[PDB]
Write a protein that binds this ligand. Sequence first.
Ligand SMILES: C[C@@]1(C(=O)Nc2cncc3ccccc23)CNS(=O)(=O)c2ccc(Cl)cc21
Ligand SMILES: C[C@@]1(C(=O)Nc2cncc3ccccc23)CNS(=O)(=O)c2ccc(Cl)cc21
Ligand SMILES: [Cl-]
Lengths: 302, 305
Amino acid sequence: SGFRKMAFPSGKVEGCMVQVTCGTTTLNGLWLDDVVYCPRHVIEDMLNPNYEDLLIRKSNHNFLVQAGNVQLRVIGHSMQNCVLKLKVDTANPKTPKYKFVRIQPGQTFSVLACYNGSPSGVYQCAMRPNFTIKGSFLNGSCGSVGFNIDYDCVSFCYMHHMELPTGVHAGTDLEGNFYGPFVDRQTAQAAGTDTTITVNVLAWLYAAVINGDRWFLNRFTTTLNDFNLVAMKYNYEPLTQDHVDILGPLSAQTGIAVLDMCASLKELLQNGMNGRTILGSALLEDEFTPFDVVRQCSGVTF
Amino acid sequence: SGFRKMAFPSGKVEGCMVQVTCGTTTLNGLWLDDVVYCPRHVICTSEDMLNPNYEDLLIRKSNHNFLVQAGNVQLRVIGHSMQNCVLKLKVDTANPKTPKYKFVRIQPGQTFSVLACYNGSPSGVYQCAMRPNFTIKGSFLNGSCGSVGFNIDYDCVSFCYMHHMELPTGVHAGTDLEGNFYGPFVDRQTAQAAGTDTTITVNVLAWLYAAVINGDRWFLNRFTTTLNDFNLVAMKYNYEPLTQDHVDILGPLSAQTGIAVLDMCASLKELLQNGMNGRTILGSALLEDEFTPFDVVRQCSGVTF
Ligand SMILES: C[C@@]1(C(=O)Nc2cncc3ccccc23)CNS(=O)(=O)c2ccc(Cl)cc21
Ligand SMILES: C[C@@]1(C(=O)Nc2cncc3ccccc23)CNS(=O)(=O)c2ccc(Cl)cc21
Ligand SMILES: [Cl-]
C-alpha cells in the first residue's frame, strides 16, 4: 500500500554528471562514452548571441571539464542545435546502456538536479501541455538532465536550459531541440496558458481505487464527446480514444470502465471534493501516467 | 525557483542492495563492507509471525541456509548474529561499492529518502517523513522488506530506516540500522495499529517560510501570538506542540525573510481557521508537513524574492 511521487533510481545518471566551465560560466554536462553534452549557452552575449561566431573563437583548451576530482581533456567540439558536444580524451567507464528519446507533453520523467557537476537531488515531473516543466532549479542547475529507465537502459529525454519569469522551466531533448516555442537567449519569453493532463488524472483516480479510496465513484457513465465538452470548460486536455485504450488495463483491474471514471471526474470538476482528499491530496493530481500507476502498483525493478 | 518534494540521489545506496533468501522467504539486504543487514523476520514463516521465538528459530540455522545474491553473483555467508530486530550476515566479500556511511537514529518530524527495492533490485526513490506516531506513509508492496531510508548530506550516507512492516491502515513501520523499532511496534503479527497521527507543526512553518522565499505572502497577517496561545489553538487541529527548540531551529529562516517565528505562527493559526479560499501555497491546497527547516534551507535560494 501507499502511493508516492516516485522517481527512477538515479545511480546510472549520477556516474555521468560532470562540471563544464567556459570563462566565467560554470554549469553541468552529461558524459557518455567520449562526449560531454551541455547547453550551448555555456559559451551581454545572451541579449543577441550568434552561437557560431562565439564558438569559432573558442579553442578546445578553453572548455574546462571536471569529472569528480579529475580534469578531462577536451580534444574536439561541435554544436548540434542548442547542445554543445565536447569530445574528450577519456571514455566514461561508468557509461550506462542509453538512448536519446524525445518525449511528448503529458509524459513524466525523473530529474537529477546538479550543481558544479555534483548531483544534489532527484525528483519526478511531467512535461506540461505548454512544454514547460514545474521543476526546482537554482542558478548553476543548467545541464541537469531528465530521464526514464526501461529495463537496464536509461532514456535521456531532457536537459535543463532556462527558467521563465513565472518560475517554471524550459529545456531541450539531448539532440538540442527545445521543448516548446522557446529560444536560448535573454528576450521576452513566457509560458503559455497551461492545461491539466486528463489521461494522467484518470490514471491517478484508478490508483486511488486500487489503494482503497472509492468515495468519488458513482453509478453513472458518459460518452467521450460529452466528457470532452466538460474537459474543455475546465482547461483539461481533450481525452482521445488512444487515452481510453491506454487506460484499458487499469479499467480491467478495478472493474470501472474508462467512461465510468470520466463520469466521476466530471462530478469532481463540477462539485469539488467537499472537504475530502484523494491519496492525501485536495487537488486532482496529473503528474502520474497510466504506465507510472501500473509500475508503482506492481513493483517493476531496474 | 520552484519547490519540489526532492529525494537524495540514490546511487550510493543502489550499490549496497542485495537479495536475501531463507527457505521460501525472499527480501532485501543492505551490504556494507563484509556485512549484510536485513529484517530478522526473513527466518519466519507466516505461521511463525503470530508469536515468533527468534532465538529458537535462529539457533536451527547454519550459514549455508542464508542465500545472498548481489547482482548476478552469489555471496558466501561465513557468520550470522542477531542485533535487536536486525539479522547481520557476515559474508566472505567486502562490498567494493561501500560508500562513506553512518547509522543514525532519527526523531519524528525528520525526513529521509527511501529507495524501494524488490529482490535486491531498486525500483524507485521517494522522500518520506517519520510521522509523530512513528510510522511512515511509504509506498511498499510485498517483497519490499529490507528497503532502506537515508540522508546524504555531503559525501556520507546516513542510514536511518529499514523497512519491516505494513500496518492495517496501509502505513509502514521499521527500525533503525541497529534493529530498534521506531514506535511501539514489534516484528510480530499482533493487534498493532498506528496511533492517532498529528501534523508536524515545525515543518508546516518551514514550508510557509519556503513559500515566502519563493515570492508568496498572501497568507500573512498583521498579528503575532504567544507560544502558549499558538499551542492551545494548534492542538485543536491535531497539530504537534511547537517547542522552544522548534522556534530556535526556525531562527535562520526568520532572519532571511524578516518574519518573526511567532508572526508566522499567527499566519498558520489564521490558515487553520480559514482554509485557503481557492488559493494554493507552492502548488498545494493542503498545508505540507514533510519538509524540515533544514530541507527548506538546502533546496531554497539564499535570496528571498
Ligand atoms: C542561463 C539563463 C537561465 O535561465 N538560467 C537559469 C536556469 N534555471 C534556473 C535559474 C534560476 C535562477 C536564475 C537563473 C536560472 C539566465 N537567465 S536568462 O534569462 O539570461 C536565460 C535566457 C535563456 C536561456 Cl536558455 C538561459 C538563461
Ligand atoms: C512481513 C509482514 C509485512 O508487514 N509485510 C509487508 C511489508 N511492507 C509492505 C507490505 C505490503 C503488502 C503485504 C505485506 C507487506 C507480513 N505481514 S504480517 O502482519 O505478518 C507482519 C508483521 C510484522 C512484521 Cl515486522 C512483518 C509482517
Ligand atoms: Cl533527527
